[PDB]
Design a protein around this ligand. Structure first.
Ligand SMILES: COC(=O)[C@@]1(C)CCCN1S(C)(=O)=O
Length: 435
């Protein structure tokens, strides 16, 4: 696999040992051939799992999730997918890695899609080798792949709100369950219901993942309520998965705003990854997978793929050339390569709005291309009356950096800035000039 001009899709079933057995072997061979190597982890929890698998091998961990003293003589770097894309965007020089290994290469966040497009373009140009590690590569139509032990699959009605009766099977269980919900707000309602019934519940989401995941090992639990984030390597010691088979989809309407459409069916890849959390111990057959809906290819027209093109149009590759999206996922967006390319100063603003401002890619692009500087927050208050952000059924309010009390009415409306209590609290601080 290690020869140039070759991208290998390592697609063993979930739990086959791609991380703990296959990855150290690849790394030993790459170190033997003096290949400059990058290992890309989806999250910080996977990066820590990787240090345990690669202990004793000379790897430079470019993450603060690991506390290692680096010798300064390593030719293998390990960083998160987002870190790689971030450094490609920033003026920091990134080595031209001879071998690029992406673990959990099915991740659909904009920074992951952009990293795949960049790496696969370098391979197509004959400059590098690449290994994409995932049981569910782009385009997969099998939601029921192989497992370490047999799984009991059951199509059943799954509650999406609190309930009083009709779902005795949910609470009559004596093992541990991992339940996938379409959103944080939906997970809160179901968690409150289970807690009221005497259950011990832990809730996972993107912003709280590293902190709350530790609780699955530190304390006894009955249920874990999670969003799609637990599809990226998150290992659990569970005997059941309750899968709503639903997710929210960001959609750009009329090129003017972003809405959170749905809940709608997950892809075949997501359903297979959610099921993949159980049936992993060959000595414990009969883990349960209860699913409450079907799959559809909801990745078509999803805004993440448009955002990855916004990222790639602003990364240098060679003169005026721009990296293309990885061919199996290149048709999910109707976008012309280069249409989002910004000049030096607007690009610098675009980067800072995502990196420091913590804004979604699409929203940061609208601000930067309009000629607005990073610290100028006047667009947070001068939008139309139907762009008013609502908190507790009343217009949200902030004190501006001038000391004036104003209604949050952004010129560009992106539903992700107020999708939950935490996101809106962060957007209020941004609009106030607090970061
Ligand atoms: C945490 O998010 C990031 O780091 C990414 C890679 C996400 C999209 C671009 N930004 S950016 C400006 O490069 O920081």
């Amino acid at each position: 696999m290690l020869k140039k001009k070759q991208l290998t899709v390592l697609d063993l079933h979930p739990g086959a040992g791609k991380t703990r057995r296959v990855l150290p072997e690849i790394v030993r061979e790459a170190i033997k051939k003096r290949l400059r190597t990058v290992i890309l982890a989806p999250t910080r929890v996977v990066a820590a799992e990787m240090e345990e698998a690669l202990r004793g091998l000379p790897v430079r961990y470019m993450t603060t999730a690991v506390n290692v003293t680096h010798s300064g003589t390593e030719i293998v770097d390990l960083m998160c997918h987002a870190t790689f894309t971030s450094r490609l965007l920033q003026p920091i020089r990134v080595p031209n890695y001879n071998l690029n290994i992406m673990d959990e290469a099915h991740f659909t966040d904009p920074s992951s899609i952009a990293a795949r497009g960049y790496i696969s373009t370098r391979v197509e140009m004959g400059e590098a080798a690449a290994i994409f590690m995932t049981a569910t590569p782009p385009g997969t139509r099998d939601a029921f792949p192989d497992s370490n032990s047999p799984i009991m699959d059951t199509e059943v009605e799954v509650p999406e709100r609190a309930w009083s009766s009709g779902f005795d099977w949910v609470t009559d269980h004596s093992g541990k369950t991992v339940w996938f919900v379409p959103s944080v707000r939906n997970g809160n309602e179901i968690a409150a219901c289970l807690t009221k019934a005497g259950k011990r519940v832990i809730q996972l989401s993107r912003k709280t993942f590293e902190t709350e995941f530790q609780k699955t090992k530190n304390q006894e639990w009955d249920f874990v309520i999670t969003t799609d984030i637990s599809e990226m390597g998150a290992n659990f010691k569970a005997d059941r998965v309750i899968d709503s088979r639903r997710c929210l989809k960001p959609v750009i309407l009329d090129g003017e705003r972003v809405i959170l459409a749905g809940p709608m069916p997950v892809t075949h890849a997501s359903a297979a990854q959610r099921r993949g959390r159980i049936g992993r111990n060959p000595n414990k057959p009969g883990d349960e997978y209860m699913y409450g809906g079907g799959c559809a290819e909801t990745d078509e027209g999803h805004a993440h793929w448009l955002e990855a093109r916004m990222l790639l149009d602003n990364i240098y590759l060679q003169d005026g050339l721009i990296a293309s999206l990885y061919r199996p996922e290149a048709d999910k967006v109707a976008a012309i390569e280069g249409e989002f390319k910004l000049r030096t100063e607007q690009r610098k603003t675009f980067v800072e709005l995502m990196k420091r401002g913590d804004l979604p890619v699409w929203l940061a692009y609208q601000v930067a291309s309009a000629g607005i500087t990073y610290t100028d927050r006047r667009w947070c208050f001068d939008g139309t009356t139907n762009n008013t952000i609502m908190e507790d059924s009343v217009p949200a309010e902030v004190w501006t950096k001038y000391g004036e009390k104003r209604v949050l009415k952004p010129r560009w409306m992106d539903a992700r800035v107020c999708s939950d209590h935490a996101a809106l609290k962060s957007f209020k601080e941004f609009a106030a000039g607090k970061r």
